[PDB]
Curated annotation (Swiss-Prot), chain B:
The gene is rpoB. The lineage of its organism: Bacteria, Pseudomonadati, Pseudomonadota, Gammaproteobacteria, Pseudomonadales. It comes from Pseudomonas aeruginosa (strain ATCC 15692 / DSM 22644 / CIP 104116 / JCM 14847 / LMG 12228 / 1C / PRS 101 / PAO1). DNA-dependent RNA polymerase catalyzes the transcription of DNA into RNA using the four ribonucleoside triphosphates as substrates. This is DNA-directed RNA polymerase subunit beta. Belongs to the RNA polymerase beta chain family. The RNAP catalytic core consists of 2 alpha, 1 beta, 1 beta' and 1 omega subunit. When a sigma factor is associated with the core the holoenzyme is formed, which can initiate transcription. It comes from the Bacteria.
From Swiss-Prot, chain C:
The gene is rpoC. This is DNA-directed RNA polymerase subunit beta'. Belongs to the RNA polymerase beta' chain family. The RNAP catalytic core consists of 2 alpha, 1 beta, 1 beta' and 1 omega subunit. When a sigma factor is associated with the core the holoenzyme is formed, which can initiate transcription. DNA-dependent RNA polymerase catalyzes the transcription of DNA into RNA using the four ribonucleoside triphosphates as substrates. It comes from the Bacteria.
Length: 95, 49, 100, 85, 50, 158
DNA sequence: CTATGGGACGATAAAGGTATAAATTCTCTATAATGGGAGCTGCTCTGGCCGAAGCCCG
RNA sequence: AUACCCUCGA
DNA sequence: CGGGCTTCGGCCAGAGGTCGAGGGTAATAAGAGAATTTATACCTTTATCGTCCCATAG
């Protein structure tokens, strides 16, 4: 349900032994994309994993019984941004 | 339900769990039953050592 | 290169000069400077993205990024302290090669 | 919000702009005292504080000044998440 | 979560069997929310105990 | 303890779990030598805050004092505003600003010196000192009353 | 007859001195020593890339 | 709680 | 007969299912001693800020 995550990428670890969750890899993400289901896919790759401020807020919402799902931004993309920057090639946004 | 009642396919699994007394920087950790903040029934299950 | 592009009728040469034009116009439009390809300064990853996860028993597990960064830092420090004392040219160039 | 993520060459000036210090020491942590060293790969001057809202010496431990950098402690007291950016 | 699958011939097409422990672990925050809403648990420690 | 529980609940409501257990902190801790999980503890903090707000709803001043003493952000601002409205009803804008600054200084918020308050307001040190002395006792009495009222419900709900 | 500004007061925290032990890096030793070594070998294709060798050709 | 190696299931 | 010009052959890059599950293994040796800096520890000096007596304005 919830537990400790990996320290580099804030994602649940793997395997009964470290608790851990199954991974919605590329193929399962494609399967969700083939369906029109985008909200569950976005919540799945955003709220259930890789978002620090999203996980706790979603837990709050579930406990109070409302399902709002404030999105936020995955932490793995931030990690990618910093790695690409450390490769000496600039990344920004157009705001 | 006979195959469970006659207990034909039950198996015995043995698993082990380990503890090591590390030379911690402040001091060696000791194998003592006076765990701090330990409940009574759990200590009752344990021995003096 | 644009002036010399249509002078030659060779397909291979026109292709090479077309690639040259593409790169030059990309650099001109993109606000990118050619000198930036050779980095005179390089970044270092934030520590949690290159963490050292301590092994149980008081050991520390160092990531490959930490080893590579340490190697670069060591060779850079060697470079400065061997140029500041005017080491011979051969060893200086060897050190520059090592840093590269 | 945002859009249109860009990619370009990193300028030395913008590389300086990105950084929060000049890493100069190869070693990372002292074997005697287990805190990152000055100008190291984990230095608190550059990358941030080890403990959230804390400094190197503990001169300021209160949770009030989240942006002020102390006099003795040049390592600015801030949240521990900042070691990632 | 995951487990070995098993044919259920008494299932309607829209439903699937789910073990008690997997369902209890997966829906733990929902159970906590319903327990607090019904008032059967006051503190989350009591809800975890139940 | 009721005070400890309220303080922990306010801190956990104000501060999210955190990006992760810091790798340097984890490394330093593991190389130098709770019953509920993080999200569970945060949910417990939210439930405790809700219970405290509901129990103390009969005394708006007590709830404002609790929010000012323990909570942060919007709750702290509301508590400070309610305290200013209660202690100093007819304060002028300069007087209101000075009272707000003094109340923040009481909760260890900046500014931390009455001299800075005088510089930002222009009030005499004698009047500021007397007002602070009276307000500290008043707020201590209010907080003690609120804690005494909430101690029984906290033990009742565990 | 009372609330408030004004001024006196004083207990202490910071600032600077100022040595002082820790601690942590820096510098030396004089028979002679003067090109390293693991590196795989059993993909498979596709694709691109240079570079060389024929192939028109006027 | 990081990387390889081995073994196994669909 | 040199010269563009097409074509071909050798060389290197990249890419090769997913999700489990379990197990295991992960990395060493100059002492001396001189010197320099730094964290520590005690102490004095100045300002600061908490503090209250006092005259006065309404």
């Amino acid at each position: 349900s919830t537990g400790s995550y990996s320290l580099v990428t804030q994602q649940p670890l793997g395997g009964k032994a470290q608790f851990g969750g199954q991974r919605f890899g590329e193929m399962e993400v494609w399967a969700l994309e083939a369906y029109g289901a985008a909200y569950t896919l976005q919540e799945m790759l955003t709220v259930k994993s890789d978002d620090v401020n999203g996980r706790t807020k979603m837990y709050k919402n579930i406990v109070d019984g409302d399902h709002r799902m404030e999105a936020g931004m995955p932490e793995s993309f931030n990690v990618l941004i910093k790695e690409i920057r450390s490769l000496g090639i600039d990344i920004e946004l157009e705001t | 339900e006979r195959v469970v009642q006659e207990d034909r396919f039950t198996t015995i699994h043995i698993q082990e769990l380990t503890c090591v007394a590390r030379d911690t920087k402040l001091g060696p950790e000791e194998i003592t039953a006076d765990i701090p903040n330990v409940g009574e029934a759990a200590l009752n299950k344990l021995d003096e050592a | 290169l644009r002036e010399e592009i249509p002078q030659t009728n060779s397909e291979t040469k026109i292709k090479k000069l077309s690639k040259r034009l593409k790169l030059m116009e990309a650099f001109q439009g993109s606000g990118n400077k050619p000198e930036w390809m050779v980095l005179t300064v390089l970044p270092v990853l934030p520590p949690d993205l290159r963490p050292l996860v301590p092994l149980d028993g008081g050991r520390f597990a160092t990531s490959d990024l930490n080893d590579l960064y340490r190697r670069v830092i060591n060779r850079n420090n060697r470079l400065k302290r061997l140029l500041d004392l005017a080491a011979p040219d051969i060893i200086v160039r060897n050190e520059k090669r090592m840093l590269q | 919000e945002f859009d249109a993520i860009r990619i370009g060459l990193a300028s030395p000036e913008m590389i300086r702009s990105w950084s929060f210090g000049e890493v100069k020491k190869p070693e990372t942590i002292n074997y005697r005292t287990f805190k990152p060293e000055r100008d190291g790969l984990f230095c608190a001057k550059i990358f941030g504080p080890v403990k959230d809202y804390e400094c190197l010496c503990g001169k300021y431990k209160r949770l009030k000044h989240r942006g002020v950098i102390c006099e003795k402690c040049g390592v600015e007291v801030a949240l521990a998440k900042v070691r990632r950016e | 979560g995951r487990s070995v699958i098993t044919v259920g011939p008494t299932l309607r097409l829209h439903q699937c069997g789910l073990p008690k422990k997997m369902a209890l672990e997966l829906f733990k925050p929902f159970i906590f929310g319903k327990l607090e809403g019904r008032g059967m648990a006051t503190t989350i420690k009591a809800a975890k105990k139940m | 303890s009721t005070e400890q529980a309220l303080a922990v609940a306010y801190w956990m409501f104000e501060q999210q779990p955190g990006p992760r257990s810091s790798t340097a902190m984890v490394i330093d801790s593991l190389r130098e030598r709770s019953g509920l999980s993080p999200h569970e503890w945060q949910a417990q903090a939210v439930m405790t805050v809700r219970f405290a707000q509901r129990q103390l709803a009969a005394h708006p001043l007590e709830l404002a004092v609790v929010r000012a003493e323990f909570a942060r952000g919007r709750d702290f601002v509301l508590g400070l505003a309610a305290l200013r409205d209660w202690l100093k009803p007819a304060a002028g804008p300069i007087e209101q600003r000075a009272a707000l600054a003094l109340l923040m200084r009481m909760f260890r918020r900046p500014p931390s010196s009455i001299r800075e308050i005088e510089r930002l307001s222009g009030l005499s040190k004698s009047t500021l000192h007397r007002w602070d002395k009276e307000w500290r006792e008043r707020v201590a009495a209010l907080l003690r009353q609120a804690l005494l009222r909430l101690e029984e419900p906290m033990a009742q709900v565990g």
